[PDB]
Design a protein around this ligand. Structure first.
Ligand SMILES: [Mg+2]
Ligand SMILES: [Mg+2]
Ligand SMILES: [Mg+2]
Ligand SMILES: [Mg+2]
Ligand SMILES: [Mg+2]
Ligand SMILES: [Mg+2]
Ligand SMILES: [Mg+2]
Ligand SMILES: [Mg+2]
Ligand SMILES: [Mg+2]
Ligand SMILES: [Mg+2]
Ligand SMILES: [Mg+2]
Ligand SMILES: [Mg+2]
Ligand SMILES: [Mg+2]
Ligand SMILES: [Mg+2]
Ligand SMILES: [Mg+2]
Ligand SMILES: [Mg+2]
Ligand SMILES: [Mg+2]
Ligand SMILES: [Mg+2]
Ligand SMILES: [Mg+2]
Ligand SMILES: [Mg+2]
Ligand SMILES: [Mg+2]
Ligand SMILES: [Mg+2]
Ligand SMILES: [Mg+2]
Ligand SMILES: [Mg+2]
Ligand SMILES: [Mg+2]
Ligand SMILES: [Mg+2]
Ligand SMILES: [Mg+2]
Ligand SMILES: [Mg+2]
Ligand SMILES: [Mg+2]
Ligand SMILES: [Mg+2]
Ligand SMILES: [Mg+2]
Ligand SMILES: [Mg+2]
Ligand SMILES: [Mg+2]
Ligand SMILES: [Mg+2]
Ligand SMILES: [Mg+2]
Ligand SMILES: [Mg+2]
Ligand SMILES: [Mg+2]
Ligand SMILES: [Mg+2]
Ligand SMILES: [Mg+2]
Ligand SMILES: [Mg+2]
Ligand SMILES: [Mg+2]
Ligand SMILES: [Mg+2]
Ligand SMILES: [Mg+2]
Ligand SMILES: [Mg+2]
Ligand SMILES: [Mg+2]
Ligand SMILES: [Mg+2]
Ligand SMILES: [Mg+2]
Ligand SMILES: [Mg+2]
Ligand SMILES: [Mg+2]
Ligand SMILES: [Mg+2]
Ligand SMILES: [Mg+2]
Ligand SMILES: [Mg+2]
Ligand SMILES: [Mg+2]
Ligand SMILES: [Mg+2]
Ligand SMILES: [Mg+2]
Lengths: 76, 44
RNA sequence: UUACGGCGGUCCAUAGCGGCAGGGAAACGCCCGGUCCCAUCCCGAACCCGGAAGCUAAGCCUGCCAGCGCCGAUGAUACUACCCUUCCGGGUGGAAAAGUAGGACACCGCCGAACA
RNA sequence: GCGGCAGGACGAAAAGACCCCGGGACCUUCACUACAACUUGGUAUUGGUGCUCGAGGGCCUCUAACCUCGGACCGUAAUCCGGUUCAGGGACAGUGCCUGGUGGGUAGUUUAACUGGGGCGGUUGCCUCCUAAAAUGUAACGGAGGCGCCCAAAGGUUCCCUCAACCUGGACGGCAAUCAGGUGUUGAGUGUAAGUGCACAAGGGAGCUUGACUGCGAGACGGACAUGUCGAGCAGGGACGAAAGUCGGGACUAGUGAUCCGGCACCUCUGAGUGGAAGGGGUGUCGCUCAACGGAUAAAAGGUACCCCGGGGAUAACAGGCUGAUCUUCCCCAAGAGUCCAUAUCGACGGGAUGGUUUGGCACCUCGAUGUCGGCUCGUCGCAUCCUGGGGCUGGAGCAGGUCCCAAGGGUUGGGCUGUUCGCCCAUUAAAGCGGCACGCGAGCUGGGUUUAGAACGUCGUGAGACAGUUCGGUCUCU
RNA sequence: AGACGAUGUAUACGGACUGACGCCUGCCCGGUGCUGGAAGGUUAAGAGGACCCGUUAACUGUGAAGCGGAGAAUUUAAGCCCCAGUAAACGGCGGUGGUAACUAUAACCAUCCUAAGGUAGCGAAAUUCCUUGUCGGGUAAGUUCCGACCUG
RNA sequence: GGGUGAAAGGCCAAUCAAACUCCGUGAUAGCUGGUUCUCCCCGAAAUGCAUUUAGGUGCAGCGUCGCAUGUUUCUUGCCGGAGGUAGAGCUACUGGAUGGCCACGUCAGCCAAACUCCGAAUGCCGGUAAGUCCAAGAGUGCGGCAGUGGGACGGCGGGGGAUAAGCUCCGUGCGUCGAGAGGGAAACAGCCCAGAUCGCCGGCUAAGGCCCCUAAGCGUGUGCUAAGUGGAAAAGGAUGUGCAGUCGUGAUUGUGCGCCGAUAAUGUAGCGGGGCUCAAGCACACCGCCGAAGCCGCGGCAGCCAAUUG
RNA sequence: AUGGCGUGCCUUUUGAAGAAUGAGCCUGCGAGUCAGGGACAUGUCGCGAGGUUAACCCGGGUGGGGUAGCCGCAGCGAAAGCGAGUCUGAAUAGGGCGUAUCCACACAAGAGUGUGUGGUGUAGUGGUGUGUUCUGGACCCGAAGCGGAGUGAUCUACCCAU
RNA sequence: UAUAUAGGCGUCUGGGGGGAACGCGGGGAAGUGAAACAUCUCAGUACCCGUAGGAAGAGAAAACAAAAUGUGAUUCCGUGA
């Protein structure tokens, strides 16, 4: 005679899908992130979901700018 | 209540959208774009 | 080249915020007015346009200050992967946070300014 | 080997009847869906005049259809059945077809799962945090909260702006209205939970607008699958902006429902001889608390102690097993009360263990059977000793006690009431001890209790029926 | 068809409950039934068929005649709606809050509620959970028994 | 689905909440049982998701066979990454919270799954250099045939319970059993050691052992223990005793063994028995040997691979 | 004589010597089958851009005919349709599904390699073996019960005549 | 009761029952499958009733087909599938 709780939502895989030096195609997705933890640098867009994705092909960085954490592709 | 209103052309019901009976009476005329190929005014 | 004015770069304070004294050559400034282009939920305050009377008193700039804030080892310890241990405990690698020694009043890059 | 006794071989007998699971069967009703039966009208059988309400209905009368289980007569030397004929009724009844209603009187069925056994309770899909152990993912009837929307701007784009709190000075006006001016770097604010973000603003203002578009989409994320999720970029034709540019709804993630079959508009796609149409098909979109939310049907509740069959120790009741919260016997520390004096005797608050004897937790053995409380018969062991026996201390004069240590040899009565165990009482006694052994012992016994079928009472139920509520009756197998 | 009922006829026959005899059998017509009444409301078949739609002689896209698809209004009957009767029909029968001249109790009275609030009689009962109620009798000792009380 | 019934669901040919017999019919059962010859090679799962579903089943996961591809797989060292747990910290926020000084403020000492200025180790993802390489009998794609979808206990990190359970539900390129015999633990699926092709009256070892049962030490050296401690247990109580500290005796602190507390029911019965202190006990040293189906030796079979032999 | 070591078999289970199930014993019988131009994989054999016949008729027979048909050979699309293309679309815009495949050359340069000229030139189908599968009782045994047509009152329930 | 019937009387011919399967006509289940269950399936099957004949039914277009196009009663088999 208890438990008013005992519900949960589906997990939604939500994590950095591309780490470090990886070769990543032009439209290829990376860090899904709810609420833009990471911000878009030079060759990454940001979707309406706050999902980041590559614009150009190249190699993923993870640097920073002005205190913010930045993802960006540099070319090969 | 938020009912389901179809938008019709002056010439020529491509679309339908939610608007309400209380806040927006005299149901809406806006504008919007296939048969003609221009943005023609559409009324409720 | 010298206390000049812009526009930047740094896994953005060792660049900050204060304190005390200096700066005005061109320039940045406040300033001087509201006709002209353009403005205020009201006001030429601001946003604009038109000028150069009066000054560095402020911004901006350059000094010297550990005053707050920041940065921060080395060496220990906690924790820990793996191993060995009959409870307890230790063995070979990783290794903080905290506090301490001290750092620090930034450091660079190409475009002008008047003097070359 | 023979005679005996029955403690065990979880003895023999009966694929447990209890319990749950899924198949059946009867029963019940305001479950569902038919049907019988009963009644209602239309219309055939079914006709003739009359009088009227009418925008074909209501009725009158008549006899000829049709009826009589009214009589007489004949076939016929019989209360059947025909035929004839008087007397009645009469286009009504009955009967066919069509059709509304009533309808457990019958018939076929349905009546969910999870679940520390089942029932009652709670829950069922989606979003958010923690459990979750620094990628992702992750259980429980673990711990917290939300959603089934709202907004024609709370969307798009171009500009500009910085909050809350706090101190100081002001008519009404105060620790809250507005007014200035200071400190103030994120506390405030974000349509909506929480988290992640956001001061460069995604927060606060204003001007114009409708991209809350049409045809598309390289490439990845995520997944059993079905879903779902992001998307640069190209074109048409537009919005804002001087431009570069951004715009395919909203800071982000909840706000939804697959298929099937229908509804509407649109398109020259087809059109069963041909030319048209009907119907089909396409593009666009509408109808599901299908919420038990991957939806078994368009359409569905209960009882069974009258039960039946198939299974299970995958799962309960009895006993064993582990555990020991709760019970039980000791113990640590003494605040104290005992005239004074903690420890003669009691000992609060708090702490630590023993025992497995109570109520429990768990589900490990047995459901192709481990058969049942109390009593009788027969016992056997332990000591935490009721009596007898031996000791220390005493707030022990003596008698009689108290308390603690030692000790298991023997002994521990008969009746009253209750099925009782326990308990209250009675008269005694040196004393009327406490426990274990399937709460010892039914192939040793009884059958009062519990727990089958009968039946009445109170209660709950529309009802069948139900109740660790009472009541009376109720097969005890084996060489 | 016919049969029993019955070779009976309301002092008879069928059904429902109750159960010799004695004294009795209170209140409720809201619900559900059953009985009657029908003035209106709603409605099925069958009649009726305006207005539409398909085709084509005629008119060059415009439409009447034939044929046939869709079929609205207007018409009714019983039922249900509605109004009454009926409880020896199935059933149903209340709540709290105050008050007496010592205490206690509440004749009484206030206020809600319903269709109406349980009357007579009985009561710890085949009915009473707490329960071995309390009190008396019976017994050396009565969880049963008998007689009372009423907190049914 | 009818009869009869002074009514119990009674009785209707020993059977009745719907008789019996034959035929539909070899009814159906997600249920229980049974399925018969041999050797060889390989070898699972007891999880995820969905379910009028939970003891059934569909697809994925894990097995096998055949055809592709030919090291990609796995391992270790480097390197480039994101993380918010352990720990810690809090005038760094959000709560809870102790004591001073004057509610606040200041001065200290704190606590936290749903607190974070901070912040590991491990694991994870990629790139790279070798290793393994007559082998893992790998990895990935496609197909034929599967079974499984009741797991259990141990180690470590958790939830629920009382931080109870041989409890229950999870995580872990965690193990074993399931499906693994052998040796050790007296006996003893899950613990330690180790993977059984067959034969041998051959050696060397593992865990664990060496007085006798019982194969091998009454082994050696320096100490401790008097309680059969060893061969069960607590909060506590106490001039038992050995060493190392600290102001001939008293206090004091550490530390090795030991004493009491200690106490359930058939019979010693809490060393596996005997027996052990003349240590067969305990601690650290030190030589040996015993001990497996492991390893080696000699010999015989078979499978895959590359040159009958390896 | 004696010594060491050693807890039946099967089923079903997390786990069985189990005190869980099943069998007293022996001999004989008793469970994966067969039909179909069936379906998909896969051997093997005939013929190959073709392969093969079904009813049926002539035969002493298993051997001759028999081209109707089915499969391959062109697709894409809702369809009309057009066809190495085609469909959605305003589109020499992309994308979907096809053009047997593997080669060189050309261009493009690229966002993961595309488009073309040129060569090469495909492999199905009908028997039969095995695996599994569809429809049939489909590996074998076992309910309680459901429906149809009959058989029962010599037992028992009740009534009728005597 | 009379035109006559109903009946009565005398006479000739036929029918009545049985059978294994096949035939045609009419009535017509359920278990089962749908992993429940009503539509649907099982199935026009089991079973029942009538009535045959060596065979029986059907049968001589109020039929198909789609025009540059025709075939020519019915039944049965293969294929369309
Ligand atoms: Mg004997
Ligand atoms: Mg037995
Ligand atoms: Mg059974
Ligand atoms: Mg029924
Ligand atoms: Mg259940
Ligand atoms: Mg439960
Ligand atoms: Mg992890
Ligand atoms: Mg994670
Ligand atoms: Mg104020
Ligand atoms: Mg036509
Ligand atoms: Mg579901
Ligand atoms: Mg379902
Ligand atoms: Mg049974
Ligand atoms: Mg038990
Ligand atoms: Mg037992
Ligand atoms: Mg069990
Ligand atoms: Mg047995
Ligand atoms: Mg004693
Ligand atoms: Mg007993
Ligand atoms: Mg007995
Ligand atoms: Mg016995
Ligand atoms: Mg009895
Ligand atoms: Mg009642
Ligand atoms: Mg009797
Ligand atoms: Mg009575
Ligand atoms: Mg017309
Ligand atoms: Mg009964
Ligand atoms: Mg009988
Ligand atoms: Mg029946
Ligand atoms: Mg192997
Ligand atoms: Mg499978
Ligand atoms: Mg911590
Ligand atoms: Mg399952
Ligand atoms: Mg499972
Ligand atoms: Mg598990
Ligand atoms: Mg584990
Ligand atoms: Mg654990
Ligand atoms: Mg367990
Ligand atoms: Mg020896
Ligand atoms: Mg010696
Ligand atoms: Mg020795
Ligand atoms: Mg001992
Ligand atoms: Mg003793
Ligand atoms: Mg040796
Ligand atoms: Mg078991
Ligand atoms: Mg198994
Ligand atoms: Mg056995
Ligand atoms: Mg035995
Ligand atoms: Mg048994
Ligand atoms: Mg036998
Ligand atoms: Mg047996
Ligand atoms: Mg039968
Ligand atoms: Mg008789
Ligand atoms: Mg079925
Ligand atoms: Mg079934």
């Amino acid at each position: 005679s208890s438990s008013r709780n005992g519900r949960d939502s589906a997990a939604q895989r939500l994590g950095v899908k591309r780490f470090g030096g990886q070769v990543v195609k032009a439209g290829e997705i990376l860090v899904r992130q709810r609420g833009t933890h990471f911000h878009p640098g030079v060759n990454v867009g940001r979707g309406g979901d706050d999902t980041l994705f590559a614009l150009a092909p190249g190699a993923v960085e993870f640097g920073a700018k002005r205190g913010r954490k930045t993802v960006n592709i540099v070319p090969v | 209540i938020r009912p389901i209103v179809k938008l019709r052309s002056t010439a020529g019901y491509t679309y339908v959208t939610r608007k309400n009976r209380r806040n927006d009476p005299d149901r809406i005329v806006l504008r919007k774009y296939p048969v003609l190929r221009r943005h023609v005014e559409f009324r409720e």
